[PDB]
Amino acid sequence: QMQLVESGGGVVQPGRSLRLSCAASRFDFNRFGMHWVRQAPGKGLEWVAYMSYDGGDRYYADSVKGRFTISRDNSKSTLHLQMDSLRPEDTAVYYCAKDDILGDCSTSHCYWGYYYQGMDVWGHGTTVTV
């Protein structure tokens, strides 16, 4: 019921690679852009990745620039993130979130400058240790 679930994560030593998965339940996965966000223990959150609804655009923060790769598949309704070359500063909990704005309209008659709502539904997040 308008929920996301997360899979992956655990204990892992540096110099390796993981792949986390986020499965969507009911709403849709072909009309919305998704986010990957993380939070380190003792700190606040930080946006790490954004992906479009059709995959026409992908953005990452510079902290995980290069060694990270985001993707999705709508028919299976799941968003995957591959993280290689881990660093001992990437020990944190990760969530996936949805955009409270439709994707195809977001630039034509649905413009984000006027009618953007932030992020309606969140996940629960899995922990990763380096």
């Binding site: 946006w47 984000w112 953007y116 629960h124």
Partner: protein, 108 residues
């Protein structure tokens, strides 16, 4: 690059009274601000977007305000449920945006 700083990151306040939080930006961000609230063991919800707009199904004690680079968020009659951690998020370069650091309110 734009980064915002919330203060104080810790404010212990008794239930029942009014309290206002502030979040100022490095450079002027406009009106592209969102107020997130996170409770442990519970998904986070959006409180205010457009830097002053109460989202639907939100009680009528939360009220945002301010523009430019000095934004504020006020609660009127803080009760038991209002104990969480709050963040100010910006999207001046949508879809890419940065967060704040947070503010965890407590009881005296």
């Amino acid at each position: 690059e734009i980064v915002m700083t919330q203060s104080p990151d810790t404010l212990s306040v008794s239930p029942g009274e009014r309290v206002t939080l502030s979040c100022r930006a490095s450079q002027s961000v406009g009106s592209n601000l969102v107020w997130y609230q996170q409770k442990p063991g519970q998904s986070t919800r959006v409180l205010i977007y457009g830097a002053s707009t109460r989202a639907a199904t939100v009680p009528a004690r939360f009220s945002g305000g301010g523009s430019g680079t000095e934004f504020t968020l006020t609660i009127s009659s803080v009760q038991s449920e209002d104990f969480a951690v709050y963040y100010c998020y910006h999207y001046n370069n949508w879809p890419r945006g940065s967060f704040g650091q947070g503010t965890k309110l407590e009881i005296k």
